[PDB]
């Protein structure tokens, strides 16, 4: 069984989105479909349920009104429509299948989830800045270099060092949302033997904007 998800994700406040959950691997009208929301702040929330077999639908009073669940039996697709979008609607939405087990149901198969990001930001490529050890002797034996990837949108960017040949000692940090734009960084620790006798470059790719930037770390 497989629930394949996706619908519009990058939206502006005030709009609406219609996300989809297409089921495969079983007889679609045989099991109900549930929708769950999960805001970055850990927790899971049950939205409503829709049984394409009997057309029964039920909502969580919280989402009743802002949410409309529908299904297209012909294509085996479940939909959830969100309207009057706000910043608090930014979350990951999953669809899960219900299966009866003597007495109640279990959400036995889950979709991969669809990330809904409500923002005012436009597609913006990042600014990559090489970070070389400063002033006084920074580190002994090993040397730590970095790369600051600032102000891009949307996620994600991929960071690599020396086209990926340099994979050990690298730490790439989860991007953080600053002023509606993402900022992230990555560090690499190489023995004092390599840099700057050997070249260290950070390579960052931003698919959304078809951008690629190579920044060599050189001595200050």
């Amino acid at each position: 069984v497989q629930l394949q998800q996706s619908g519009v994700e990058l939206v502006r406040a005030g709009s609406s989105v219609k996300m989809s959950c297409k089921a495969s691997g079983y007889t679609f009208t045989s099991n109900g479909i549930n929708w769950v929301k999960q805001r970055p702040g850990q927790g899971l929330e049950w939205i409503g349920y829709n049984n394409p077999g009997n057309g029964y639908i039920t909502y969580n009073e919280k989402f009743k009104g802002k949410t409309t669940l529908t299904v297209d039996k012909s294509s085996n697709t479940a939909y959830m429509q969100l309207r009057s979008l706000t910043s608090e609607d930014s979350a990951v939405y999953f669809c899960a299948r219900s299966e009866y087990y003597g007495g109640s149901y279990k959400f036995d198969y889950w979709g991969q989830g669809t990330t809904l990001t409500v923002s005012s930001a436009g597609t913006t490529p990042p600014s990559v800045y090489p970070l070389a050890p400063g002033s006084a002797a920074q580190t002994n034996s090993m040397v730590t270099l970095g790369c600051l990837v600032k102000g891009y949108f949307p996620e994600p960017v991929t960071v690599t060092w020396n086209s990926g040949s340099l994979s050990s000692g690298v730490h790439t940090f989860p991007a953080v949302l600053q002023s509606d734009l993402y900022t992230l960084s990555s560090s690499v620790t190489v023995p004092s033997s390599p840099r700057p006798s050997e070249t260290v470059t950070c390579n960052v790719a931003h698919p959304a904007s078809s951008t690629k930037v190579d920044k060599k770390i050189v001595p200050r």
């Binding site: 927790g43 049950w46 970070l131 050890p133 730590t144 600051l148 730490h171 940090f173 991007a175 600053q178």
Partner: protein
């Protein structure tokens, strides 16, 4: 609604340990309790249903029990792949509700962070911005306190902190903290200090650089 509370919100255990997670309901749920596992990659699967029935394809080290309003999920011998967030869900009445979730991490010996600080790159300074970055790498426990100081005064404004998930191989965490100023404000101060406070030391770890120190 039936309120579901998972006792340990986060839990540290060493591989091989027997782990047990609690879930309490606000009223008798008649055994209609299922457990879900959310891997660090965000995906979720059903683990146990109807209090103790194991779902096909799940490892035999997971078992569940309880009645009334008290249930538990126990991992008989913690494996690395078990590092995840676990959620109980009640299926006794509408609306369906979930517990807050329990996240696990592997317990290891403490480890002091390797701290390094970086002056703004000249490329950035040309754009009139200035970001000072401080990396605090490979430490344990996760709890760490970072404070920024400019000529003796402290941070607060303009700091962005980010943490990595627990490293699968050495079980440590890393953190990055960035202080962003305008080029104008940056050039009016001399020293920049990244100061960390961690369990591993009574005295903070301090890394600084002076703007003028052009070596």
């Amino acid at each position: 609604d039936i309120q579901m509370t998972q006792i340990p919100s986060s839990l540290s255990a060493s591989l091989g340990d027997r782990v047990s997670i609690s879930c309490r309901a606000s009223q008798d749920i008649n055994n209609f309790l299922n457990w879900y596992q959310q891997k660090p990659d965000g995906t979720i699967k059903l683990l146990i249903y109807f209090t103790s029935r194991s779902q096909s394809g799940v490892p035999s080290r997971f078992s569940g029990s309880g009645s009334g309003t008290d249930y538990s999920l126990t991992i008989s011998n913690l494996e690395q792949e078990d590092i995840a967030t676990y959620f109980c869900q009640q299926g006794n009445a509408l609306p369906r509700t979930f517990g807050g979730g329990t996240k696990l991490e592997i317990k290891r010996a403490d480890a002091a962070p390797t701290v390094s600080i970086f002056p703004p790159s000249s490329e950035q300074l040309t754009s009139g911005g200035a970001s000072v970055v401080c990396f605090l790498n490979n430490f344990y426990p996760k709890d760490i306190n970072v404070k920024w100081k400019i000529d003796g005064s402290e941070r607060q404004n303009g700091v962005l902190n980010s943490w990595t998930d627990q490293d699968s191989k050495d079980s440590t965490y890393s953190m990055s903290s960035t202080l962003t100023l305008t080029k104008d404000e940056y050039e009016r101060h001399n020293s920049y200090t990244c100061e960390a406070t961690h369990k591993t030391s009574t005295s903070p770890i301090v890394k600084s650089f002076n703007r003028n120190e052009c070596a």
